[PDB]
Amino acid sequence: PRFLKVKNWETEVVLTDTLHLKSTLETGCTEYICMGSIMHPSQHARRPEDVATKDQLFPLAKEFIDQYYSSIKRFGSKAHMERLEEVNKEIDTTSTYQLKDTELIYGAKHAWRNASRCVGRIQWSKLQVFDARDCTTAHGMFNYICNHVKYATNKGNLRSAITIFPQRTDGKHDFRVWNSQLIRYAGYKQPDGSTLGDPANVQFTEICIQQGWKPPRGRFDVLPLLLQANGNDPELFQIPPELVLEVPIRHPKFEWFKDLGLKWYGLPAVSNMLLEIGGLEFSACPFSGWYMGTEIGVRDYCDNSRYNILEEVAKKMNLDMRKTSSLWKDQALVEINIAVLYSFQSDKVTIVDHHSATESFIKHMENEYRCRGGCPADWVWIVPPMSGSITPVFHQEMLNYRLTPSFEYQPDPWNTHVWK
């Protein structure tokens, strides 16, 4: 029916969802099977694999233009009807259409607003949008990305931003950032078989080396940018180091911590996702905000197939590592996340702890149910990866559904690119 309730089991607040009635595409679940913990549950996309026919693209365009003109209290106005007819002609004569600046901004902000996996969405309407649709080469992509990084970093007072490159046309002329984030550290396969640096990035690191990058072969080597424009072969660029803000990790109590020689970068900037607005696909759309401390201290530092530094911290702390039941992993994990937050705050680099972020999200949910009739949210991703049940989102029921505009996953370009 016309409503589904969600309950918080701590406060007994009940919210009533009607926004899900506007959901467009499949979650992957059914009556009989829930796919809520599948990373990529569904391949349901809104238009086929490349350049659609008119009957495929125009309905999606009309739906978005309708939604945008409703959003600004028109619908049916002179400009709405003209825009429809203008999109109609543009598709007739080019097989696609071009978004207005206002529509582009509306679409980007609503993709963030609709991102059910993102705990940071209370900030969704404060997003700086850089229109990079006039770009034609990898050199121009590099210039746009450098300006984004400089604006977003803002000497540590971080600012959310997205830079949007030309949309897909036929699928052979894609713009792509091959990096998964604008700033990541290299990972190196070692002679014995261990890994130096960040193990997630071993393959991408090897592509960069195989493209002519000379690796300094350290533990915190900022990877080059690997940029593809208009379907051509990708090109390597070194981000100027003065644009890459980094934080040395120290601990407020353990003076030995800084001798671990750890650091991390300040700017999280996802660059491998696809932005979908009214049937248009922006395959290069790097966006950035600021970290929740656990993203560094829990996942980046302590995943087994990542930096895996729990061993060292625990040793220096003189914990019993004979058996799991001493909870030495849990104890070192806390100290590391204390140190990360203390270090970012000491250097006045924007960062949020998982207690503050999750409390912000409960408040965001309440705002969204009050003004919008709902808020799509993926509990599996929203609950932080440590200390789950002492955060308020753990006890919050959530409904997950897919709204458009949206951010989507896309295949890695090196599986699909035909080299020249």
Q: Is 14 in the site for a second copy (CB under 8 A)?
A: no
Contact predicate 58/95, CB 8 Å = no
* 290 binds ligand HEM per the rule CB under 6 A: yes
User: Diameter of the chain by CA atoms?
Assistant: 74
Site string for ligand HEM, 161-200 (x = CB under 6 A): -x--------------------------------------
18 to 57, contacts with a second copy by CB under 8 A?
Answer: 20, 23-39
φ/ψ of 14, rounded to 5, equals: -115, 130
Whether 228 and 178 have beta carbons less than 8 Å apart is answered as yes
Which residue is catalytic, options 206, 295, 359, 397?
295
103 is catalytic: no
As a dihedral over the C-alpha atoms of residue 363, residue 367, residue 370, residue 371, rounded to 10 degrees, the angle is -170
Residue 324 partner contact from ligand HEM, Zn ion, a second copy, none using kind-dependent CB cut-offs of 5 to 8 Å: a second copy
**Taking the complex as a whole, how short is the minimal distance between the CB of residue 36 and Zn ion, in angstroms?**
4
Provide the CA 219 distance to its chain's centre, in angstroms. Answer: 24
Contact 190, 196 (CB under 8 A): yes
Alpha helical stretches, state H, 347-385: 354-372, 379-382
Cβ-proximal residues to 182 (8 Å cutoff; 6+ apart), any chain: 145, 148, 149, 225, 239, 267, 269, 271, 286, 288
Read off the DSSP letter of residue 413.
Answer: H
Per-residue x/- mask for ligand H4B, residues 8 to 47, rule CB under 6 A?
A: -x---------------------------x-x--------
Asked if residue 197 lies in contact with residue 205, where contact means CB atoms within 8 angstroms, the answer is: yes
List 277's β-bridge partners, or say none. Answer: 280
Cα first-last separation, the chain? 54
Q: Which of 112, 118, 276, 402 is catalytic?
A: 118
Structure token digits, residue 348: 């006045």
Active-site choice (46, 113, 121, 184): 121
- Tell whether residue 181 is among the known ligand binding residues: yes
Does residue 358 touch ligand H4B according to CB under 6 A?
A: no
The verdict on whether 335 is a catalytic residue reads: no
* Count of residues near ligand H4B by CB under 6 A: 9
C-beta of 171 vs 388, nearer to a second copy: 388
Among the residue ranges 106-114, 148-156, 316-324, 389-397, the one whose residues contact ligand H4B (CB under 6 A): 389-397
Q: Check if 290 is active-site.
A: yes
- Coil, strand or helix: which one is 274? strand
Residue 74: how many other CB atoms lie within 10 Å: 14
**Is residue 407 close enough to count as binding ligand HEM by CB under 6 A?**
yes
> Using CB under 6 A, which of the segments 146-154, 288-296, 325-333, 363-371 binds ligand HEM?
288-296
Q: Is 121 a catalytic residue?
A: yes
> By C-beta, is 104 or 118 nearer to ligand HEM?
118
**Residue 161 in contact with residue 151, Cβ under 8 Å?**
yes
Give which of ligand K8F, ligand HEM, Zn ion, none residue 112 binds (C-beta under 5 to 8 Å, depending on kind).
Answer: ligand HEM
Helix (H/G/I), strand (E/B), else coil: 407: strand
Among residues 4, 15, 80, 39, which one has the least CA distance to residue 367? 15
The verdict on 133 binding a second copy (CB under 8 A) reads no
The beta strands (E) that lie in 208-262 are given as 225-228, 235-237, 246-248
Query: Could you tell me how many residues make up the chain?
Result: 420
Spell out, one character per residue from 337 to 376, where the chain touches ligand HEM: x when CB under 6 A holds, - when not. Answer: ---------------x----x-------------------
The interface region with a second copy, picked from 99-107, 181-189, 276-284, 291-299 by CB under 8 A, is 291-299
Active site residues: 118, 121, 290, 295
| Binding residue ranges for heme b | 118, 409
Sites of contact with a second copy (CB under 8 A):
4, 6-7, 9-10, 20, 23-39, 293, 298-299, 302-305, 310, 324-327, 329-331, 333-334, 337-338, 341-342, 345, 353, 355-356, 379-380, 383-390, 394, 396-402
| Binding residue ranges | 37, 118, 181, 290-291, 295, 380-381, 394, 409
